[model samples]
Target chain A: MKQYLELMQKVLDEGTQKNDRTGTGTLSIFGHQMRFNLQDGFPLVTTKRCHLRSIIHELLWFLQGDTNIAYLHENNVTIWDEWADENGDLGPVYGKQWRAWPTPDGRHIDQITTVLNQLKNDPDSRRIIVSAWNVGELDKMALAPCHAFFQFYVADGKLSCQLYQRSCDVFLGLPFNIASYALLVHMMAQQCDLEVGDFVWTGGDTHLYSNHMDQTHLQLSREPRPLPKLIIKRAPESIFDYRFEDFEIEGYDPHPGIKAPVAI
Target chain B: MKQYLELMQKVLDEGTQKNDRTGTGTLSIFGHQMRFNLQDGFPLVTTKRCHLRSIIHELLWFLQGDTNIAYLHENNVTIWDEWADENGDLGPVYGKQWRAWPTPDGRHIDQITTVLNQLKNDPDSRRIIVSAWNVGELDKMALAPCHAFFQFYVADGKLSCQLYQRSCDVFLGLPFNIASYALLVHMMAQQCDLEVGDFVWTGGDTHLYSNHMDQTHLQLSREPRPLPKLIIKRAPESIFDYRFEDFEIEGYDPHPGIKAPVAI
Candidate 1:
């Protein structure tokens, strides 16, 4: 949380002004990295209230490779609502690319399954990766991936995740990005029968949009709470077996949820 | 370079022991990152001697997307020589995946060309990515990408790159990795009429082999030379337009190259 606050302030004070495609200018900083040790508890921002419900559902949906917003929408998770089409398709987005990226030869490959198996039988394999940046299908996606790609690491029976976010709308995007992958690493550790390791957040174009500067200032004014514990209520048999009721949280006390509108 | 050395030492001191697919055991750490500002001069390892010629040519070859090892072989670049098949073809490896990742419909998408265009026309677009982790074609590759994926950023008319490497033999591979992407940022900036920004190295499993611990100490004991100068022979018409002959290097005096056997 200290790192998160420090970055927000650094961007505000020192980030260079840059024009953007969304027509919202930004103060941009390139090449930043932050690490969250799982032992430090789950990295949900405690300074401003953030929900675990949407974060849990979004991760489960991604692992299940579901692209239709129906599952998410039916569950009352509107985080993705702004980006979904009428048919509820996000079209070869994260799930499609991660689980079933199509190849020119009319073939498909599932990255998650492979990585899991690699960790299970061949932890040394450098090919243990799952990528969601589908170049051929970019035109069909409602939004190009901001949480673009990730890789897993395993050592001494501990699993960690490193995420490469191509674009981050910092005020609205980065907090969730941190929580999602940290949770994913925890889940993967349980399934892989490995210890949970650190989660590293790396960004390409990490920015605070100009309009959100005031909110950013208010956020900076608040003091960070002790990071809360994330309790997984389920002892699922497999990675995909967990359902909505499986996750719970305790010891989370924070200021009221900060409201920020989505940039899109 | 201090960051790179620190990573190697930290991982060696504290990393967990794990079995790997290559049958070589690994002492590994997951989710690490390092940043180098290119404007400060090239990021060649002054801490220890590092070869610049091989790195420059390999990058030029990757941008060319030429799967045949001919160009690399002609330039006396042995880094890629080990990965080529007897036919010298590395099918749909880095170049193909970067420029034209295939789709289910048998069409190819030129992501690199698209990225250059995006940087030129839409610097703020979050989609500026080039992926080498092609799921469908994994079985076809001689080696799965260690430098698995990367993305670029443009701010204040300068370009930078962030690379996600899933596995690294730090002492041996990191120097080359830094130079390759730093040079890439330079090339991309020149092509887009932007200035060079930064090169961020993000890793999944970053480690030093137990056997190389002594070499690591010896290397760390030596003083670093001034960072090298990378000359790309000015702007080419297209990324593919550059040849092996077009690249040049100067001011790279260094200690004799260290020999460490590949763990594989």
Candidate 2:
């Protein structure tokens, strides 16, 4: 949680003011890295309240390879609604790329399943990576992937994951992004029968939005509480089998939720 | 240059001993990041002599979208020789992916040209990126991209680049990789009418080869020298138009080169 707070402070203190495509403006910094060891509780932000509900459904939807907002709507997650079209289609976003990245030669590579097998069979491999930044299909995606590429590493029988996020909204998007990946790491670790090591988040163009300055300062003023323990109630048969009811967050006492406007 | 040395020492002291696909074991660390401000100097490893000839040619080759070793041979660079097939072909490696990534809809997306256009027209863009880690085409590559993905940032009229290298050979491969990207930043900035900023390198599975331990120690024992200046003799018309003769490394005084076994 301190790590999350510290990142916010860094952007607030030293970030450069710049105009953005969203027209909201930002205080941006170029490159930054943060690490969260799952051993030290879940790395959810504790200064302000954050719900695990949307993130859980989002991860599940992504794992299901469901790009349209229909699944999200059915699950009551409206985060991705604006990006959907009349058919609720978002085109070739994360789900399509992760589950079935279309190749030139008529092959769709299931990168998530590939990494799953690699973790089980070839844990020591350096090539165990899943990338969502498909150059050939960027124009078709509703939104280019913010959390773009990720790699999994195994050492000492512990599975570690590192995500390369191309753009980070430090105030609004990053907290949930952290939770989503941390939850994914836990699920992956449970399925692979290995302990979770670290979820290392690396960012490019990490920023705080202009309108969220008040909420940012107010949230930063609050003391960080103890991180809540993320309890996975049951191990599902496979990585894709976990349901939203399987997750429970225990002991997430925090300062009341600090509301902020979404830039988009 | 000191940033590079610190990385080697970090891996030497704290890296986990793990077996690799090359069958040469490595002293590895999961996630590490280092930054080199290009304004400081060219980030060449000065502890030992490193020739810029091969890196320059390799970069030029990548920009040319040439994947065969014939161009490397013509330039007297043999680094990519062993990886090439009987016809000197390396399949669809960095060059092919960078210049023209094929889509399922039968179009080739030139990522370098895309980034170039973005830097010129939309420097404020968050999505100015080039990814060589095409999930659909990894199996076709002779060597999967180690310096897999990268993004460019523009702020206050200076351009910065961040590279996401999945697997780094800290001793043998890292120096060349750093210089290659740093040189690219300079070239890119020059072409885009901007000044050079920082070259931040983010690595996953950063390691020192077990066989290179002696050479690593020998290099660490020596003090680092002042970094050299890279002189691009002329600004090429386009990003694709740069030739081998247009570059020179000045003030590269250093100790003798150290030899180590290549893992593959």
Candidate 3:
């Protein structure tokens, strides 16, 4: 959490300012890495009043490999609301690419399923990667993925994952970014029967949009609270098998949540 | 260079030990970032010894979208030789994927071409990424790309690139990795009408292989010589239009080069 705050400060105090396609200028820095050991109680940011409900449901939606936003909206999550089209379609986004990447000859490649099997059968394999940077299909995505790619690693019977987020909206999205991937790691470890390891975050153009600077300063003014603990209720035993109520969080006492509008 | 050396030492000393698919056990640390600014001049390794010839030629070959080892063999650069098949073909390796990634349709996509066009016509676009993580063609590759994916960024008319390498043989490969991508930034910037910015490197498994521990230690013990200067013969007008002779390195003096075998 201290690292997360420092990154925010780094971008604000010293990051180079640049214009973005989204019409939101960014104070951006490229290629920074952060690691969170899951054994250290889930690495949720308690300093900010972050919520786990939306993240959990969004992840479930991804595992379902459903590109449309209907399921997410049905669960009262509006994270993807801004990006969905009239038909509630967010074409070939994270879920579609991860669970059902389409290949030539009308075939489909389920990267997550294959990655899980590889981790169980070959823990040492370097190919435990899930990528959403589908070059051929980028034009078709309702929104190109910002958290573009990630890979899983195993050592000492512990499974870890590192995400390469091509773009990040630090204030609102990054906290969600950390928890989402950390949860992904926890879920994957459970399915693979491996102990929890680290969740490594790598970024490109990691930024605080100009409008979020005030919110960034406010966050910096607060002291970090003890990290929240993540508790998975159902013990789903598979990365894709968890239900919405299967997850829980305690100890997330924090300063009141900050509100900010999406840059788009 | 000090930062690079310190990172090398730290990972070798404290990184988690893990078996690898290449049969070369590794000491790995995920999510590490290093920044090298181009204004500081060429980032060729001054510590121990590094040859710029192979690094430059290999980059040139990759930008050319070559998959055969003939071009490298012509220049007597054997870095990619070990991975070649009987016919010197390296199926869907760096160059092929960068220049001609296949799709579900009969057409192929050239990421490098797309990136240059994006920079020229839409510099603010966040989708200007070139990935080598083509899952459909992974098994056919001569070796799965360790430097799995990379992305481009532009700010203040300076273009930069960040690479996400999944596995690294730190002592032996990182220097080349740094120079290769940095040189790539320079070449790409020239073609895209921008200046060279920083080359930021991000690695998922930044490691020193077990067999290379002594070699890493030996290299670490040697004082780092001053970094050398690289001259790209004539700033090529475009990314694809570079000849082998259009490159030179100056100010490099060091002990004899060290030899380390590829883990694959």
Candidate 4:
């Protein structure tokens, strides 16, 4: 996870100060890219303890294409509670766009299914992309997608994914964002019967909120430990067939959790 | 220009051999990014004598929400000629998606107009993005958008742009892609009354077609000259209102053009 820490340091050293919509000022940088090789073990942050439980459940919920917060609350994950309306509806967010993007002609395109079919039938195709940044539906989303778009590529019988994030809260969101996509890549590779490759993360307006500067520095102060290995219990029938019990992390020893306030 | 040269050299050295849809084999690398500071000068390729006339005309045509080759032909730009049908139609391509993306509820959202509005009202907003990679309307396009999605960021009273290109034909296509987006950033800054900042180019499947290896080596052999300057003669009242006569490039002396076969 030196890649993750190096970016944090870069933000502190070179980022410009800017006021944000949350009214929480930030030290932000415009463009950056980082690649984590999945073969080197899962790219989990070692300097701080992270709740893989919430990350796993949230991903499962996303795959279910459930935009409402009822499933999340049932599992005791409150990360999205602040964004949900009183009726538990978060509008058409990531899950809705990823699984079923509605077209102007009344057809819903399932991007996940489309990408899986492309990977299996045409691995070398450059257009194997899944975009959640639906231009027509932005106004209806509870919050605009931060991880706006992503593309998958296959080479040497290994599947790799790159995520293009439009905005990032580095202190609180980046770690979780990295793991969620990394896990997604692992599962996709499993379903396609290929080896794991790299997970490249690209960011625009990547920032550390002023309130989380102390926490960011504290995270930088600690030495990074060895990355833990992710063990999938079994290969499921399809991309969306896996449940929460199917995932297990081994040797994930890390430092204590550092608390930070969410910008919004 | 060193940044562009560096990427070309990197692809030559580390890219994996892959078969592409064009059946022209390529040495491809999955994810890469390059940043050019617009304040230094216009980021035209210094090693090759590029025609700025075509790039400028193409951009103006796109802003017109045109999906046909009539305007390009009138301007004597034949770059997009290969992709046009018998009637010069390109279906719903970059222009249609940029100017008016259709919604399921029978509305057209103009992303460029929306970005301009956001820049004037709230420069710091992270949601200022324009995407041409409309997943729902992909089948309707003649050629999928290579420089698919882009976002704008403002800080220190300067506007910077980042482009996420899904596929890049490095030897032949990348130079134009860079200049096109940089040109857009400059025009955008002029219209919004902000200083020009950086133009960040990100790619998913960056490659050099195998047939273009000789041209690639020739380009790498020459030393990069100082970048040229871009002059917009006048600021248009709106983003969509721009004429080719309003633009000029000065001091763009370079090595002779090297020819390469088009992948299509």
Going through the candidates in order, what is chain B's TM-score? 0.92, 0.98, 0.94, 0.98
Candidate 3 all-Cα RMSD = 1.7
Q: Candidate 3: list runs displaced more than 4 Å.
A: none
Taking the tens digit of each residue's C-alpha lDDT, what string does model 4 give over B123-240?
A: 9999899999888789988899999999999988999999999999998889998999999998899999999999999999999899998888899999999999999888888878
Q: A217-256 in candidate 3: lDDT tens per residue?
A: 8899999878777777877656778988888888778788
Question: Which scores higher on DockQ, 2 or 3?
Answer: 2
Full ranking by lDDT = 4, 2, 3, 1
lDDT of 2 at B114: 89
Error of 3 at B61 (Å): 1.6
Poorest lDDT segment (10 consecutive residues) of candidate 2 chain B:
B133-142
lDDT of each: 0.79, 0.91, 0.83, 0.92
TM-score of chain B of 3: 0.94
Predicted candidate 1 versus true structure: per-residue lDDT over A1-264, tens digit per residue = 689999998898888887777777889887788888888787888778888789888888988988998888778898888888888888888988877888777767778887888878876665567778777787888888888777777665678777888888888889988988988888888888888877888887889888898888889999998888878887898787888788777778877767866776
TM-score of each: 0.93, 0.99, 0.96, 0.99
lDDT tens per residue, model 2, B119-149:
9889999999988888777888888889999
List model 3 lDDT by residue over B1-264, tens digit each: 776888897796679888877787888777688888887878887766776778878998888899999999999999887888999999979999999888866679989889888988997776678888888888788888989888888887888888889878887788888888888887887777688888888887788887888878777887877677767767656778887678777888875567776676
- In terms of lDDT, the poorest run of 10 residues in model 1 chain B is B17-26
